[PDB]
Amino acid sequence: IVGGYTCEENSLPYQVSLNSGSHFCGGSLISEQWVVSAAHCYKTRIQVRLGEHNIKVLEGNEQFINAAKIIRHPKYNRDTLDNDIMLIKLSSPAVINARVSTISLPTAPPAAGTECLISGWGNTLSFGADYPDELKCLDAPVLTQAECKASYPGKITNSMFCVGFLEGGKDSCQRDAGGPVVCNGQLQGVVSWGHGCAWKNRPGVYTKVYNYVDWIKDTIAANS
C-alpha cells in the first residue's frame, strides 16, 4: 500500500495472508473455511495465516492453516487478467474470535464515488522497495468505468473496476494482490493489477467480487 496508514490493531480481522516460504499475497476470510484471493496468487501449496498484525513479530494468537483446496476461476485468463479471483478452502475451520472474523459478501455493486478500504502488506514505495511488516490501510474512492478505461485503454474487462486517485500517490502495490477492498462493510474487490503503483493516471485495477457471488456460493456448496 502506497500513501496509506498503519491499520489500527486488529480492526481488519478478515485480512489474511498467503504464504509459501514467505508472504506473497493477501486474502479475505468470507466464511470459517473459505478465503477469497486472486487467481494470479495461485500456487500448488499455500499456507494461510490469519489474525496477523505484524507478520514477522508473532503475538501467539495468529492461526496458520494450510489450503486443502485452491480453486481458480475456471475462466481466469493469464494474458488479459479477466476473472482474476480464486477460492481457498482451509484444511480446518478458522476459529472466529476478535482477531479472526469474516467479511460479508456484497449484496450490490459499489456506486462509483463510494469510499472504500484497501489493505495489505504490499510495497509502500512507488519507486524502490519498502515492504512493511505492519498491516497498512488506504481509503480510496471507487472510480467510474469511464475513468478506469480512460486510464487503461482497451484493457478493462467486465470483471474489473478501478479504485484510487488518478492524481497518483495512493495505491495498492506488489504483495497486496488478493487482498480486500471493503465498502460499507462488504467485500467489493480483490486487489489485482495496475501499471506501476500509485503512478499518475494509473489507478489500481481490482476484481468485482459482486460478479462472482453465485460462483463463490456454488463452489462453497460443491466442496462440502
Partner 1 sequence: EVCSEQAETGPCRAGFSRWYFDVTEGKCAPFVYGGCGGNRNNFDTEEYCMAVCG
User: Which positions touch partner 1 (CB under 8 A)?
Assistant: 21-25, 38, 40-41, 78, 81, 122-123, 129, 131, 172-178, 191-195, 197, 204
Chain-centroid distance, C-alpha 26: 5
Least distance from partner 1 to the Cβ atom of residue 77, Å: 10
Least distance from partner 1 to the Cβ atom of residue 122, Å: 7
Decide: 168 and 202 in contact? Cβ < 8 Å.
Answer: yes
What are 90-95's contacts with CB under 8 Å, separation 24+? 90/32, 90/33, 90/34, 90/35, 90/48, 90/65, 90/66, 91/65, 91/66, 91/67, 92/33, 92/65, 93/32, 93/33, 94/29, 94/32, 94/33, 94/50, 94/63, 94/65, 95/63
Radius of gyration of the chain (CA): 16
Least distance from partner 1 to the Cβ atom of residue 69, Å: 20
C-beta closer to partner 1: residue 47 or 61: 47
Least distance from partner 1 to the Cβ atom of residue 191, Å: 5
C-beta closer to partner 1: residue 193 or 210: 193
Decide: 54 and 133 in contact? Cβ < 8 Å.
Answer: yes
DSSP H helices, the chain, are 145-151, 213-222
Least distance from partner 1 to the Cβ atom of residue 109, Å: 21
C-beta closer to partner 1: residue 33 or 206: 206
Least distance from partner 1 to the Cβ atom of residue 50, Å: 18
| Strand ranges, E, within the chain | 5-6, 15-20, 22-31, 34-37, 47-50, 63-72, 86-90, 115-120, 136-141, 160-163, 180-183, 186-193, 204-208
